[PDB]
Amino acid sequence: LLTLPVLMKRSITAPLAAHISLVNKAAVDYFFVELHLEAH
């Protein structure tokens, strides 16, 4: 009737967190260059 009941409901949605982690990695540059924040 399901062989992973709670165990892997989240695992269907969990590649979203990978997209998020990429968008996050693509958030740092705006401050590193579009500001030159830490050079300031």
Binding site: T3, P5, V6, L7, M8
Partner: protein, 144 residues
């Protein structure tokens, strides 16, 4: 109870499908089930009086599955396959994903607390020699 239901539909196509019967044939035809039911009636009367719970029903089932009568030893075998199903589900739940899904219950596993082997409510036919192994891989997943 599917066998009893089947063996009670199979008379419906005679009590008005064969225009005369006498209850001597009925008494005989259902005398097969005169044997099985009190043997499982004592099982549910044991449950209703002993307030059995959790996996501590698998001992009652497996006990009276040692009654030598082959019909009874098949009926309570087919109950036993279902309930092993459940405890297998709980054990598939816990061991690869660290999930003690055992709400309001005991699946015999009570940081090491709620990660402690109960053994009062543990099946007699399952040893502590392997329950210790279960508990250890359970704490293993809990720390990764």
């Amino acid at each position: 109870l599917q066998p009893y239901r089947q063996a009670l539909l199979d008379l419906e196509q005679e009590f008005l499908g064969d225009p005369h019967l006498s209850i001597s044939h009925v008494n005989y035809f259902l005398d097969q089930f005169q044997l099985l039911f009190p043997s499982v009636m004592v099982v549910v009367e044991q449950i209703k009086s002993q307030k059995i719970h959790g996996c501590q029903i698998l001992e009652t089932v497996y006990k009276h599955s040692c009654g030598g009568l082959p019909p009874v030893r098949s009926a309570l075998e087919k109950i036993l396959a279902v309930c092993h199903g459940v405890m297998y589900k709980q054990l598939s739940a816990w061991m690869l994903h660290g999930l003690l899904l055992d709400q309001h219950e005991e699946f015999f596993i009570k940081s090491l607390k709620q990660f402690s082997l109960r053994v009062e409510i543990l099946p007699s036919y399952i040893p502590v020699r392997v329950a210790e192994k279960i508990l250890f891989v359970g704490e293993s997943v809990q720390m990764f």
